[model samples]
Target chain A: MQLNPESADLRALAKHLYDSYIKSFPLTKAKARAILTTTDKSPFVIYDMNSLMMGEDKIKFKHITPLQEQSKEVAIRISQGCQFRSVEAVQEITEYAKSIPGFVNLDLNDQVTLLKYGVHEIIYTMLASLMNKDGVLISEGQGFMTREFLKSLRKPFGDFMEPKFEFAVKFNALELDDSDLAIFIAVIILSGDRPGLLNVKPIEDIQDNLLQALELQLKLNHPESSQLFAKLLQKMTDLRQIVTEHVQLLQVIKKTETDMSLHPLLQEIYKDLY
Target chain B: MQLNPESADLRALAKHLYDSYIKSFPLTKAKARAILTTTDKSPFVIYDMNSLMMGEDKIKFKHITPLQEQSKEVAIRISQGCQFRSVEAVQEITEYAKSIPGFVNLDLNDQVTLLKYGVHEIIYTMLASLMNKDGVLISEGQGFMTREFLKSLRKPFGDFMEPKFEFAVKFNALELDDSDLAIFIAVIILSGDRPGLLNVKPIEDIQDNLLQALELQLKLNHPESSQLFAKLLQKMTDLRQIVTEHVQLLQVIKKTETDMSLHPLLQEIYKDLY
Candidate 1:
């Protein structure tokens, strides 16, 4: 397409990043759609305050039952989410990370540490596929959950989901293509600023490559929306705070419930994030 | 209409804050829209790399010439923003601050100190009237200045404007009504976290009133976006970083250009935010 002559070096880097991202993740959202299989209705039934208030006899919740401990439902949601994102999505992200030029060469612990902290950010970014302002597409896009439905779940659990949906709805407006998203995710993973990174400079250098690539791509693709580059950085800042909020929500859950135990893998990630 | 029966105390506070914000500002953006006068064309002409490169023969730029130093343009943009925001908007905000019950009762030094630290955040929030993703309305709504046009101005200055636009674009998606915007502004001005406040407790109490009011209002208005509460708080975090960034830009400008002097009031605000 059209070009800025001064950005020749960066443009080449951008092209490399785009190609690398496309090959590694091949139609990112569509790839996600394939992995998440369909069912007739969502297991996490949609219920809001009003629905629950009136539901003694009239309308039966498809997935929700009358008067179970709300914490159990929250536990169910977390376990279900971990399977899709932490287990499956993380595997895909891990593969993609290994494919990137210098990522495989890092010390194994630093590599794992980056994934632990950055996974939530990456997973949330990936959620753009199944979500919108109204609600996320559930049961493999067959069942749609209302925003209030998720908020209807339980205490901090419901409270937490809405903020995530808020990010999803707002973030989708950036209108990113998969290539832009790929590089964005790469920069997040390679970020040298994560608390336990052992070798900062190499990671920073790798991240800067992705950063410039993402920016140059944004500049070329949305010449009109040059502000988007900064907005994405602003989004990363928001992601960190949201992750901190996640840590707080988990703390509340762990303190109150005697029996709720995190997945072993999730607990490892949670420890670092906490 | 409908109400949360449990939040009676918070509901009463929300009403009080809403009423105070409304009576104080009338209509927040419309109040701003009135104060800014109209013009046909902007002083800062729009230019991109293409425009500048090809401009010798055809399409004489109305407001741009060959060029003086780019730094002077950076200085000019800051001073112009200062008049609209620091001078005029600060006066209006100062009046609003005085009427916020406990705000006037604070020590005189604390009063001025709050204004000094909070004005840029306040000013940027106020910019909602004049700005959107594309660009801010310059010379009133009559003259539209393109985003690139502002970015085309100079180093650090051009670098800075995009991120502000990034925030404006994302922030406006919350679809805040003027009353909501008013409470948001009040919460910012009353933030107890500002350095050097004489009495922290009183300011924090005032901030909590506005914060709960903002949360309750967000809950009431868009129950769909319970997350907007946290997101707005998240925006404040982003604002702090952007303000820190503004401080960095000013330092850059000051170090290299000996002749460029800041406005007296702005210098005071800059000193505090710095």
Candidate 2:
């Protein structure tokens, strides 16, 4: 999509930060593994790596965690007396908000609103990328999964603060502030090392993808313009889609009335659902 | 009508205000006639007191003005085949901020995100109140509409530098602030005085009337408490129906549209059909 003036600015700013991130330093495998450490399993393991990989490939979003109370509430309000169906209710609300594109700003919060309006998707791709930055690899007992390799490169990086990032600045009917994209890169590298640990590298990455997206605009006239722009747009669009979808998911969770245990962070998912 | 904490406060505040207002001044035929000082054709009094007396039995809720756009860019963005319908679009978008009851608490800007949610009657009510405050009155002669009266009263005694009243604070849902039943009464009197100018006032009056609503709340051992609230809820339902039917009478004028002249505050009514 051609960028509006404001969007163009945001895209440039986000990409600038992203490029700086890539150029700053390399995330060693040891460091990556450290971030993946867990007691129940090896240093390079997660609770459900296989499921995530399957999710990554399929791009299906859902998180059946202990945190699902709000979704239940939304279900109750919108579904009348129907049993709460997770994605269905959320999707319903999401679609309603989406129909009014200008009102939604196509941002993360918009996604939250949709859930309330009632479409809910959990575990956005950008978040998934943050969880396994070193990319997919084999785990000792888990066989082949992205978390397996990312867990091998161990480094002490402290607990990441659990806060959902708002990937867009939504204003009123006039214009949106430039979109600030949160970028996550999980370099999927294949390697089989320790039979027990299925060691791989884990890189904690945080950057704005809009900078690369802006570069796409610069290279639009080149021979490989289409390809370059496509990749750039895809990444940026993923960020947009993730933000929008995530926001809707938050709303759906909040509006859906259910008995599911409510997660504190997930509670952040309401609002912006017009 | 039994007071919730907020509503109770609103009632006390509004009643005290209404009492103060009526006690402070008297409405005489001369003063009411003085309000009709101007005339374009044959001299005539504007504030038709007789009409008020004659139409005491009738009540209605009337909308006065449609949306306004003074600037070209806003006009286009809102009306020129663009997405947003009005400033309300801003409120709609702002809604996608956080989830559930949380969204319910977002500040004014967040609520603005929902602007694109479209031309809801709530928005119309808000606009009418605002326009009246702005002194954007309909003074064909010296006669004033109910909207004009409310708009005219919006000014505080001496604070020209600042907007004396702000709906954001008064009706802010997040703050959990509320108005009392007295305000509703005052509002009714205003509506009842001129059902034509402030069409909505009449509607509120009718809504307040059905089911002996006033007695149920005001009278002790009234023998009607059980059915009062239920009937009042039904009044709300009927009010919605009444308003829906009158939508054509309040077609929102899009000043920003390319063909601004073509749009009228109210759609053309075919008298034959009626």
Candidate 3:
């Protein structure tokens, strides 16, 4: 009755989830690496800081905003770009979440609760895709943003990105392929502890199944580190902390004490939770 | 030719390490639990701060120092007691290290270097033994020290313990048994990156074998925790950071301006490195 790592159905389920995840994410880190090296590339899609914080964004510069527009253009395009990317993150995450066996069975409110809290974690995982050691690619690898440049941006804007940026760099070290992150997303969404869950068991059960599959996959795929499984478990804990900080910093912008704006959609979620 | 997780030899090898590690550590958290209760227990072996830091200690109060002293009795017994315990940590760790395959094949100096650097890591793993949510059991479960009490101690002394205490509390959550830590110790000692390696390959190869054993054993023993293995890996990384900071704090004492004393043997290793 329990999920068995050795069971054929379970193995197939993990594979099923992998393909679902792959289809949603589409781009791979390896391909991004190839594009990064090309001398001819589009400008980074940077959001104007003031503009993005003001809830103004339609998502662009997917190839447009390079380096900077005066200083102001830099942070603005980056902020605007993130809001655009996050919208996609929510959609794709919702798509992948639907693919899980038990997800739809959960109550409508509970579903919101899970995604509302868990999406940040999922987004951070996907964020690793656009990251390299020195900077993150903007506009989906069309343009790049350096750590120092981000640091140069205004207080909350610059502050919000570092925690996950630090995590992204370190996470990339794991070199997870799409298949690895596949089950990881499952675990993220089905996390048993999201507050106000009408029911905890089904979600926890899903987490357990994903975990077994995750363990098996790690063993099969990455023989190099026996502790990779543990590394990931701890990373989950670490990821929670980073996302919490990310939200908290983002929340700071919500107070409007600082001169900044959030995309209306991001603000909606931030408002929903905060 | 390669270490296979499925190999009978690997299974036995992991089992071999379990027993070896178990023999060295001797106490189980389960047993430690029994002593933490029952109301009546020996006082903690607190070292006298000025006295112990002056390089004087024989190791006692494994059931002695209750709550602290004249304050003088407090830090001194703690300082004095740590030296005594660390010496034993060195011996047991060395004993366990010798039992690993190909450890003796390495040159004598590399042996010292690995022990010198890696010993702190093993010791921290063991430190998880004395820790509980509220405080740590000191002097082999004879005495207890609360987190607040330690914080009340002098500057660097208070600072030195927090990182691992944080780690220890988190680590205990994994609920790994002696068998789990057994291969963990092997991985710790055989760590490939320890500086001043005359030959990195052999050490890395040994680590490879240990990791295989660790992964297989985790898969076999801790089905409930798929990521315990990765948690441990990241912990190794976390452990390194803690110890580097630990030694650095210890080195601060070496300045003599700090009015602290490290045991001569303890001092010897610090001297060798810093």
Q: For every candidate, how close is chain A to the native chain A in TM-score?
A: 0.77, 0.27, 0.82
Calculate each model's fnat, 2 decimals: 0.00, 0.00, 0.27
Writing each residue's lDDT as its tens digit, candidate 1 over B24-134 gives: 553366544443333333334224544333332222222333366655543354435534444666666777776665788888888887888777787777676666655
Question: Per-residue CA lDDT of candidate 2, range A87-197, in tens?
Answer: 333333334333321323433433333233222222232223223333332222232233332332222100011122222111111111122112222110010111111
Off by over 4 Å in 3: A1-6, A15-69, A87-91, A102-121, A130-137, A140-177, A189-204, A215-258, A261-274, B1-137, B144-175, B185-208, B218-274
Q: Where does the lowest 10-residue lDDT sum fall in candidate 1 chain B? A: B56-65
Q: Quote the lDDT for A41 in model 1.
A: 35
- Specify the highest-lDDT model's number: 3
DockQ of all predictions against the true structure, Cα-based: 0.02, 0.01, 0.14
lDDT for position A129 in model 3: 74
DockQ of 1: 0.02
- Compose the digit string of candidate 1's lDDT tens values, residues A33-83: 443334333334335544334432322223444467655554354435534
Model 3's C-alpha root-mean-square deviation from the true structure amounts to: 9.3
Output the better candidate (1/3) by lDDT: 3
Return whichever of 1 and 2 wins on lDDT: 1
Instruction: Chain A only: give the TM-score of model 3.
Output: 0.82
TM-score of each: 0.46, 0.22, 0.55
